[PDB]
């Protein structure tokens, strides 16, 4: 997901933690973050499989030449 929308919330959150509209805006951005993350070792395994296909075919052509 996008990582540029999170420090914007952290700035105001820092201000509130140091001290309705401020926390209201913070929540208004946090909802957009909720919908964003909701919309958006494992892949390694998958990588190998895809290449497995490529390797078998290369071996066949190499069977023709040799």
């Amino acid at each position: 997901s996008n990582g540029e929308f999170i420090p914007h919330i952290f700035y105001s959150l820092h201000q509130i933690r140091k001290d309705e509209t401020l926390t209201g805006s913070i929540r208004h951005r946090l909802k957009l973050c909720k919908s964003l993350i909701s919309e958006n070792s494992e892949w390694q395994d998958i990588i190998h499989q895809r290449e497995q296909e490529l390797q078998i075919k290369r071996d066949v052509l190499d069977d023709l030449y040799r």
Partner: protein, 68 residues
């Protein structure tokens, strides 16, 4: 003049026939030989087609063992 052009355009005739008969026999021999050559060529082409077939079943076995 058309008659002169036609009698001059006719194929080369001969007073004897042994030439013609000889030509016929020779042509027969050539026919037999070229037939045999055809047979051989057909055989070789068949062999090659068998080979590239073999390649194709290799590929099919590959993808079959692959995606499923």
């Amino acid at each position: 003049r058309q008659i002169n052009k036609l009698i001059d355009s006719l194929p080369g005739v001969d007073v004897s026939a042994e030439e013609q008969l000889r030509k016929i026999d020779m042509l027969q021999k050539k026919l037999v030989e070229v037939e045999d050559e055809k047979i051989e060529a057909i055989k070789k082409k068949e062999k090659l087609l068998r080979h590239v077939d073999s390649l194709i079943e290799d590929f099919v076995d590959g993808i079959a063992n692959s995606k499923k």
